[PDB]
Design a protein around this ligand. Structure first.
Ligand SMILES: C=CCn1c(=O)c2cnc(Nc3ccc(N4CCN(C)CC4)cc3)nc2n1-c1cccc(C(C)(C)O)n1
Length: 293
């Protein structure tokens, strides 16, 4: 909080469910050496992605020799609110817990005002995959991605959690056609911190009701609806303007969606229902014969 007297450091494990072992240890790591825990405890193999948040690296852990993704924040915390905001991702990630369609958090720690998030290394995001594909993804695969991500959303929504930033860039491929939802930085728990507390996801995938500060689990279904549209049709979604409004008026452009099967188009229509009270739930979608087993 910005009105409290906590205004104005070596590694410390971040957890909202752990033990007195806030101290980290690892092969390769000596606290008395000047290098950070991240530098000492991991082989840095490549940079998976980057942005205003910082960077994500593919790493090999010196602890177990396994591969992971580590997201490192851009610079030291601006202050307590900045810190609480970034640390909330860890808490979010933990409330999800272990679900086969959600990216697992291995561990998290802060050092020198920098936050590090270590997660299981999955395959490329759907966005990266579509870019490498250079075209529409086959529907056979898309049905699989839709179902997995619906299972993740069903999980989140059961606990009154809303992701609020579902998009191709944070659904990651698994082996043999599976995929996992990740990037839980914007996730909110409904009815917790009621005075707050949303920031807004990517405008391309934003549910229309959010413009009016009205949010609920339904917003995630709409976001996924547009996610699947983009990857299934190889369609660039608008950030705004006439096209943005049209996609939130139940309109599906023929010049990109003519190649959809009737069954998939039918499912997208339910997900892109402008009125969140009529929009299908993830549980209801999963109950349809076309999305079971
Ligand atoms: C907390 C970190 C978020 N995050 C994960 O949790 C995570 C897990 N697995 C992966 N895997 C992954 C594997 C390969 C690739 N690429 C292959 C190499 N290309 C040049 C780029 C694409 C790419 C990824 N990637 C993962 N993450 C990741 C990696 C890059 C970018 C982003 C965001 C969502 C922040 O944009 N997230």
């Amino acid at each position: 909080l910005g009105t409290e007297n906590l205004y104005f450091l070596q590694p410390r494990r971040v957890s909202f469910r752990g033990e007195a072992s806030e101290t980290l240890q690892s092969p390769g790591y000596d606290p008395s050496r000047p290098e950070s825990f991240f530098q000492q405890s991991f082989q840095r193999l490549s940079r998976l992605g980057h942005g205003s948040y910082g960077e994500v690296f593919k790493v090999r852990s010196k602890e177990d020799g396994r591969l992971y993704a580590v997201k490192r924040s851009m610079s030291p915390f601006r202050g307590p609110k900045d810190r609480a905001r970034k640390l909330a991702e860890v808490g979010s990630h933990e409330k999800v817990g272990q679900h086969p369609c959600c990216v697992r958090l291995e561990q998290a720690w802060e050092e020198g005002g920098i936050l590090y998030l270590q997660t299981e290394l999955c395959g490329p995001s759907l966005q990266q995959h579509c870019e490498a594909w250079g075209a529409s993804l086959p529907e056979a695969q898309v049905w699989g991605y839709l179902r997995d991500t619906l299972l993740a959303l069903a999980h989140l929504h059961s606990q009154g959690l809303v992701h609020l930033d579902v998009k191709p860039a944070n659904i990651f491929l698994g082996p043999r056609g599976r995929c996992k939802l990740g990037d839980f930085g914007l996730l909110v728990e409904l009815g917790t911190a009621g005075a707050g507390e949303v920031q807004e996801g990517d405008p391309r995938y934003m549910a229309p009701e959010l413009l009016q500060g009205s949010y609920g689990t339904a917003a995630d279904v709409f976001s996924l609806g547009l996610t699947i549209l983009e990857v299934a049709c190889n369609m660039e979604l608008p950030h705004g303007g006439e096209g943005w409004q049209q996609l939130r008026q139940g309109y599906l452009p023929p010049e990109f969606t003519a190649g959809l099967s009737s069954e998939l188009r039918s499912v997208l229509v339910m997900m892109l229902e402008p009125d969140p009270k009529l929009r299908a739930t993830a549980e209801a979608l999963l109950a349809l014969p076309v999305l079971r087993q």
